[PDB]
Ligand binder design. Sequence first.
Ligand code: SF4
Ligand code: SF4
Ligand code: SF4
Ligand code: SF4
Ligand code: FCO
Ligand code: FCO
Ligand code: F3S
Ligand code: F3S
Ligand SMILES: [Mg+2]
Ligand SMILES: [Mg+2]
Ligand code: NI
Ligand code: NI
Lengths: 268, 267, 551, 551
Amino acid sequence: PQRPPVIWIGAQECTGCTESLLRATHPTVENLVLETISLEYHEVLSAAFGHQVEENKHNALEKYKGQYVLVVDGSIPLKDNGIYCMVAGEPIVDHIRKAAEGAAAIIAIGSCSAWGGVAAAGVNPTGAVSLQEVLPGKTVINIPGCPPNPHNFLATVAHIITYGKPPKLDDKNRPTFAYGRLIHEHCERRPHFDAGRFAKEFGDEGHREGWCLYHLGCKGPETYGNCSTLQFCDVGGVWPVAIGHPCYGCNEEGIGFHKGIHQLANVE
Amino acid sequence: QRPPVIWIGAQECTGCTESLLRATHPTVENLVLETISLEYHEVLSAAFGHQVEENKHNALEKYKGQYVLVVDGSIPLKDNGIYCMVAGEPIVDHIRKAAEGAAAIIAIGSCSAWGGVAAAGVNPTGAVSLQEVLPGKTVINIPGCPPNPHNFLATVAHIITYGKPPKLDDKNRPTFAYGRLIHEHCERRPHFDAGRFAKEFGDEGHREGWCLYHLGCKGPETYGNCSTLQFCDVGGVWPVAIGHPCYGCNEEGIGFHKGIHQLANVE
Amino acid sequence: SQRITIDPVTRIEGHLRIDCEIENGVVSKAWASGTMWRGMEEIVKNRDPRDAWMIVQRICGVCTTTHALSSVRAAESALNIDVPVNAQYIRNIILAAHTTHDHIVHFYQLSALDWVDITSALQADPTKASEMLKGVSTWHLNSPEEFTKVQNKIKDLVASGQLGIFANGYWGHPAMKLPPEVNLIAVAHYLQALECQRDANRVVALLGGKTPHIQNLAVGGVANPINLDGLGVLNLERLMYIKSFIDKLSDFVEQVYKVDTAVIAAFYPEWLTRGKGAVNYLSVPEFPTDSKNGSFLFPGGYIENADLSSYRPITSHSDEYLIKGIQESAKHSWYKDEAPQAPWEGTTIPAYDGWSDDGKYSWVKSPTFYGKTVEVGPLANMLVKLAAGRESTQNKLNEIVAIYQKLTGNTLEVAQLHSTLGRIIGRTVHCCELQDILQNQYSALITNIGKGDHTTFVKPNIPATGEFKGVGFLEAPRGMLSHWMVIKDGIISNYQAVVPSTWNSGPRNFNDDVGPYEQSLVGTPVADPNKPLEVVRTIHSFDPCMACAVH
Amino acid sequence: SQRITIDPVTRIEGHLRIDCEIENGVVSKAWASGTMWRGMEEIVKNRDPRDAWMIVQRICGVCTTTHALSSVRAAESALNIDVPVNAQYIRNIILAAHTTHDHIVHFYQLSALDWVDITSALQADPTKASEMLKGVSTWHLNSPEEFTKVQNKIKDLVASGQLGIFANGYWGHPAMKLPPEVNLIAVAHYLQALECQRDANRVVALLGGKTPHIQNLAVGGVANPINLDGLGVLNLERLMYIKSFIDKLSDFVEQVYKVDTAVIAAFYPEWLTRGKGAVNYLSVPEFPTDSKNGSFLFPGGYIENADLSSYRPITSHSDEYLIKGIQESAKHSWYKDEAPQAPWEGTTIPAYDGWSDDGKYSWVKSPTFYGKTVEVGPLANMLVKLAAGRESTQNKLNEIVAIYQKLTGNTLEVAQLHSTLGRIIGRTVHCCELQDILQNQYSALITNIGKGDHTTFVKPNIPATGEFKGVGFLEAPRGMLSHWMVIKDGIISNYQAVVPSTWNSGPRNFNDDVGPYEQSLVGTPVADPNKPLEVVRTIHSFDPCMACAVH
Ligand code: SF4
Ligand code: SF4
Ligand code: SF4
Ligand code: SF4
Ligand code: FCO
Ligand code: FCO
Ligand code: F3S
Ligand code: F3S
Ligand SMILES: [Mg+2]
Ligand SMILES: [Mg+2]
Ligand code: NI
Ligand code: NI
C-alpha cells in the first residue's frame, strides 16, 4: 500500500524539530517512516547524499506533484540575497519556493519557521523571516515551540491524511488542539497563583512545595500552548514548570527570545 | 538479602494488588526479584493451603522485627470476625499476630486506611480500618481506590533506603502524595476561577476541557496527587483529564458517601 | 475416605476454601466455600441509580470495568435509554483491552505455577529450549540468550535463600511433567507476559482515566469528551496514543500465549479428559455496535446437555427467555431465604451458622437457569461460538489444534474441550479473538468521528414515583455477568448481582445438585493428599474470583 | 584528475559542503564548508548574563544540553560562583544520558548506512546471521525470528516502490564489504537502537523538563526543587522513575553497540590506516563532583605530536594554559577580522564574498591551540584517557579489541586508533564508560539528599559596573566546547562560542594549515567520483554538526 509523501527542508534550523521525532511514541519515528508516511526527502536521515539526494528531491517533486506535505524547520534568511543559507550552491529560499509550488499542505514546524524564532531575535543578523512571509500566496500551518512536542506535528499530519483536510486552526494558523489556549488558563499551579503562593527563588521553601512560578518570570500568562496538558516525552509530569522552571514563552512571538527569563509577564 | 514484606488481604477487591501490575518504577517483576522479598502474598504464591500458611509462620519468626506488613481491605468486626475467615480463623486475628513483629505497617487503599466502600452505607459487616484494629501502632495510610501504586512503592522505598517512613500528615498519609488538595493543584483551576464549567457530559464546555465542579467534582475536598502524579505513567491520565469529576475516593466522608453529582464544599 | 482442606487457595482473586473427600487417591466429593462477604448489594441500596456504578465497580479490582459497565447497562435498561454509538465503541475498547490483560495474567501469573516447575528450569539447556520452538512460534524473544538471562535470574533468586512467592512450591511433584527446557521457556514467557499485560492496561487507562477502577462511565454513555480539535479532551493525538498500545498486544498473544496453550495441552493430555463441570453452558452476546444497545460483535446462547447442534441463540440483552430463567438459591449458603429467587425479588440477608457438610458452607449463592446448573466463562463462550458457526472462532481453535497436532500427532475433538484444558483453551481463543475486536472498534470510532458524530452521552431523567426494573448483561472474562436493579421513588430499592464465579463456584443448590467447581473435582487423582496440586489445577482453570462470587 | 562537490552532506546535523580534488582515484586535496550562519553570538549580546543559556542552547538541538551547560558555566566562571553539588550531579546525569542518546543515534542513524547495504540484507539467511553472533554477544534480540521480521520490513518497503530515505543509496558499491547476514544484523540493530536512545532521553526529560532543549538550568545551579516529601517536585518517586530508565541503557550499549563497533572494524580493517585528521589532540575534564566546580570523574589533557607518554594533563576548568592557548582565525572564513583572536576579544563580523579555493570558503572559523591545529572529540578524549592510565578506558578498549581479535585473529595497536575507525571506536568506548557515570552520579545524588543536603541553587549577584570575563568548558559528544562571556556594566558585552565541530571542520587557518576534516580526506581512495561514499565515511566519523560549527 502507498504511503503519503512528505518533503522536509531544513533552513536556519538547530535540528531540534527533527530530533523531537526521535522522542515520539505515537507514531515512533520508525513507524512514521515505514508505515505512516513516505519520507521522500530529509537530509538528516537520507542514505543518499550530494547529487543523489538532489535527484531524489527532483523525482519526488515531479512524481508527487499536488500530493506531498512540505515541512520546513528553521527561519529563512533574506539578507544579502539569501546567502546565509545555501544548499547545493543555491539559497534555501529558492528550494523552499520551488517545493511550495506543488505542495498539498505546507507546515512550518517550530518557532523559527513559524515566526522567525531565536534566529530572528535581537538585531536579526541574517534577516531571518517565517515560512509564511516567504510564501505569501499560501496557507502555512504553524506548529510553534522550540521545539514543539512532536505530536503537535504528527497529529496535524495524521489529520491531513486520515480526514483529507487540516485540523481547525486559530487566526495564526496554529492547530487549536495544541495551541488553542493560554498555558496559564490550564496550568495546575493556578491555585497557587490565585492564593499568592509564589516561589521567589529556585531552591526556596515555596519552590520546593511546587508553588506558582509567576515571580520567577513565568510566561504562561501570555503563551499559547499545550505544555501543561500534553507535556513532553510521554512519561507523565514532564514540562518546564513541573520540573521547577518558569515558562520562557518559546511558542510565542514577542515573548520567547525577546523577554528575559525573569522578566514578568502581563496578566490579562 | 532483600527486605521482607508480608501482604495480607482482608475485605479487599484486589485492586490494590492489581495496581502493582501497572507500576513501572519498579515494575512488579523488579519489585519481587530485586527490591523486596515478598514472603507472603496469596495472589502470587506458588504455595497454597497448609504450605502457604507454613511460609507465613516461617517468615514471621525468621524476620521478626524486620518485615513490612501491608494490609488491603477493611477488617470486619461484626459477629466476632466471621465475615472474613482464612484457614478457619478471623482475618483480624491473622493481622494482629503479624502486626506484633512488624518493623512498619502500611494500610494500602481507602478500605484499610479508613473503611472505604466496604464500610459505607449501612456497613453490613462492621468493617473498620487497620488503624482501628491496631490501636497501639503507627499505621501508615496510603488511601485511594486504588492508589497510584507508586504512592505505596515510594513509601516502601523510603523505609528501605533511609531506614524510616516518609513525612506523614496528621492522618498518617505520606505528604509527597497526599499533602495537598487536588483542587489546590488542578490544571482546570483557571476555568473554575473564570466561571467556565461543564454542565453535562458531551456539552460544549465539557468538550473544551472546562472545570468539572458543576458535575460534582470532589477535588475541592480531597487530598491527593491525582492531578500531578496522575496514573499509569503514560501522561495526561487521571479522572478529570479524561472528563469525569473526582469522586473523592481518597477521602473519608466524600468517596462512597456523596453522590457523583453532588457538589463539593469550597474552602 | 480421607478428608482434606485447601485453605487458602492461592493464585486466585479473593478468599476460597476447597474441601475434598478422597477415596483411594481419587476425589469423590468436594465443597467450594467463599469465606469473605462485604454486602455490596446492601451498600448500594437506596442511592441514586446514577451512583451505583462507581460503588459496585468495587466488587472486584481484578475484573475491573466489568461491574461498572454491567451497572450502567442495568440502569439504562430500567430507564429505557439508547446509548450513543461512540459510547459503545469506547466501552467495547475498554472491555476488550481489560479482558486481554486479565486472561494473560490468568494464564501466566495465576495458573502457570500449577504446571511449571521452576527448579527443573535450572537444569535446562537454553539452546535446546530455543531449538524446541523453531517452526512452532515466530516470537522474537525465544533466543538462547533470552532464556539464559531468565535462567540466571532464577539461579540468583534460589542462591539468595529468599524464594518469597516461589517458596515451598510443588517442585518435583509427580504431576509436574514438563521437561527442564519447557519449564525454562514458560518462566521466560511468564516475565514477558507482564510487559504485554501492562500495554493492554495503558489502553484501558487512556479511555477510563485510570485502572484499576475506571472512571469514564455514566448512565447514558461516557464522560470522554470527543473533540478532534480540542485541547485537554479526547482528540486525535490521544486516539493515536491509544492505537499505539492496541497495536502492541497482538504478537505476544498470537506467538506466545496461544502457542503456550497448545504446548501445555501436548504435555498434559490427560487433562483433556477430566475437570468437566457441567453439561449446560451459557453466554451472552457482547460488544454492541448500533445506537440501540444491540448488533453484537460476539454471539451468545444456551447449550443444553452438551448438544451444540441444538443450542438456543441469544442476540439481545432484553431476551425474555434469558431473563426469566435466572434464579439463585441460598439453601447451602449463609443467607436466610433459601427458596430459589429471581434477582429482581432477591434478598441477601446474612445467616452465618458455621460450616456444615450437609447444610450451609459458603457465602456464594447457587444460581440456576430454569432449574439447572450451568457453567459460564470462556469454555461456555467458545462452545456457543462454535455452535453458532462463527468462523473466526473455529479458525482460531484450529490454529491451536494444529500446533498441538504437530507436537503430539493427535487432534482435539469437541468432546475433549469439556475439560480443564478445554476451559483454558477457550480463554486463550477468547484473548486472540479480542485483538480483532480492538482493531474493529478503534476503526469504527475513528470513522464515526470523521462522519461528524461527536456525541457521547444522553442525560437521563429518573421519575420520582413508580417502580421499574432493569437488567444489565455483560460477557466478562470469567463469564456471563448480570446486575439487576429495581428503582422505586427515584432510588435503588433492590440491587442484585449474579456474577460468573457465582455460577461456577456456587455450592449445592435448592435440589442439592452440584455446581461446576464441585462437579469438576469428582474423579481427580491426588498423588499426595498433603499437596493436592491436581485439585488446584482444575479449580484454577475456572479463573476463580471470590470477591466477584460473593460480593 | 577531477573536481567533485558533495553538497549537501547528509546524515549530519546542518549544512555542509565537501569539495575534493581527485588524482589517480585518490583524494589529493579537500575543502570543508559550513554553508549556513545565524549569528547566535550577536543575538545573545547585550542581554543579562542569566538569559544567555536559554538563547545559546539553540545553537544546536542534536547536542542539546551542551550549549546550555557551557553557557551557565561561563557565567558562573565570570561571577566566581561555586555550584552546589546536587546541581552538579543533576547536570552530570543530563549530560551523560544525553551523550548516550547522541552517540547511539550517530553510530546507527547517521553512520551505519555508509557501511551497510540494505538491499544485500534481503539475500541473508536469518538463521546464519543469528548463528554468526554466538559467543560474540549475549544480546537477547539476535534471534533468527527477530532478523526474519526485520528482513520482512525491508522486503515490504522495497516492494512498495517508495524507498524514501533509503532511495538511491550506495547499494552494490565496491566499498560495501559486509556479507548479507551482517547487513541484516546491522539493520535490526539500527531499529533496536531507536528504543535505547528513547530511554536515554527519558532520563534527560525527567531532569530537564523536556528534550530537545532542557529547561532546568540557571546561572547558580538548577531549577529542580529537591524535596523527598514534596508533592509536585523532585521527590523519591521521581528519582526512582529516573533510575528505572538509567537501568535500561546498559545492555544495548554493551551487547549491541560495542559489539557492532568491533564487527565493522573486522570487515573494514583498511579503515584503521586512513582518516588521520591531526597529530594534536585536546579534551577537557568532565563531570565535576565537588562543591567548587572540580573533582572531575573524566580527565582531560593535551597531546602533542601523537605522544601519549608526554601529554599535558588538564584537571581544572580554570587552567590558564588551556585558556591562553585558544584562538580563532577567519582568514579563509567569511568574516572580516582575519588575525588569530583570543575569544574574549573575538568578533564575528560577516563578510561573504563567494567561494574561493585560496580565499574564503566557509562560515566556520579556524581554531588553533598555541598556533596548532587540533582534533577534538571521542578520539581525543580516548587517547587522553589512555595517556592518563585510566584503567576503565583501557579495559573497555580491550573488550572491543578482544571481539575484533576473535573475528580476525589480529590485534589493534594504538597507532591504528589514529584513523576513521579509531575515531568511531573512541565514541563507542565513551558511550560505554558513560553508563558508569550515570550509575555513580545517581547514587551520589541519592546519598547526598539522604545526608540532609537539598540545596540546588545559589542566587547570583551581578555588579552594575566593572568588566569581568568568564569561560565555560565542557566535554561535549563531539569534543571540547567553550563559551566565552565578557560582562560589562551588567550585560553581555561579548559572547564567543568555540565549538568542537569548529575545531574539526574549520577551514585552512591563518598560516594555511589544514584542519582535521580536510587533512583526514587526503589519501582516501574513491572508486566512483559520481558516488564518493569513501569520502563521507571519513567525514561522518567526526560526527559533524554544522549548526554547532558555525552558530
Ligand atoms: S524552533 Fe527551536 S528547536 Fe526548532 S529549529 Fe528553531 S531553534 Fe531549533
Ligand atoms: S504563572 Fe506560570 S506557573 Fe503560575 S499558574 Fe500561570 S502558567 Fe502556572
Ligand atoms: S481500597 Fe478500593 S481498590 Fe483497594 S482493596 Fe478497597 S475496594 Fe479494592
Ligand atoms: S473543581 Fe475539580 S476540575 Fe474544577 S478546578 Fe477543582 S479539582 Fe479541578
Ligand atoms: N470476569 C469477572 Fe469477575 C467474576 N467472576 C465479574 O464479573
Ligand atoms: N557535541 C556537540 Fe555540538 C558540536 N560540535 C556542541 O557543542
Ligand atoms: S518555554 Fe516553551 S516548551 Fe512550553 S512551557 Fe513555555 S511554551
Ligand atoms: S476519585 Fe480518586 S483516584 Fe483521585 S481523582 Fe478523585 S481521589
Ligand atoms: Mg448477588
Ligand atoms: Mg564562534
Ligand atoms: Ni473479579
Ligand atoms: Ni550540535
